[PDB]
């Protein structure tokens, strides 16, 4: 398959995240009694870049300290089946700045 | 060739040189309760504006939290030592960009 990777801005990225949050709002309040939460994405900083993975990422209610991440496998067998979430990777581009050349005299 | 594009690392270079330019001046004027921050970040028009110039602040006790209050762009007190020459310029942070699969773009409306 020829899979297309294209460039989008922050606002277009925001709608992508918002849509995923909308698609799992139907699931999380229903399964809130199980102490489990389904996050449709995962943000991780590798290779000096912000990686935003898309998928099924689960959480479990904490006990005491001083919501824990369970990974990608569903915890409870007798929980209702989650909605279908697509799997993809988003890589944030390096930040760019419009700069006057004069103030580059700090060399 | 006035205005060009630099990425994050060179942007952090310019920020640090300004902070170093005022570090020893700020230590001298610490007793006055006055801080010269050599830049000003404005999030106007959904974009990170960073303005190069003199920005003076001062310290006071507001409810016990010791909050910084903006003073202006000039020396608040006549008998303070003169500041370093901070240039005047504007830096615009470009809109954040992302590489995304086109399928989830179509499949997420």
Author numbering:
A (entry chain C): 1 to 66, 70 to 110
B (entry chain A): 3 to 111
Sentences reproduced from the published study:
We identify a hitherto uncharacterized protein factor that we term UBP (ucm-binding protein) that interacts sequence-specifically with the ucm and determine the structure of the protein both in isolation and when bound to DNA. UBP is a highly abundant protein, and we reveal that it plays a role akin to bacterial nucleoid-associated proteins with over 300 binding sites on the Sulfolobus chromosome. Importantly, UBP interacts with the N-terminal domains of MCM. Taken together, our data provide evidence that UBP functions as a general nucleoid-associated protein that plays a key role in facilitating the egress of the MCM replicative helicase from DNA replication origins.
We additionally solved a second structure of UBP from crystals that had a distinct space group (P21). Interestingly, these crystals, which were twinned, had four dimers of UBP in the asymmetric unit. Two dimers were essentially identical to the initial structure (C2221); the other two showed the same dimerization interface, but the subunits had undergone a ~10° rotation with respect to one another.
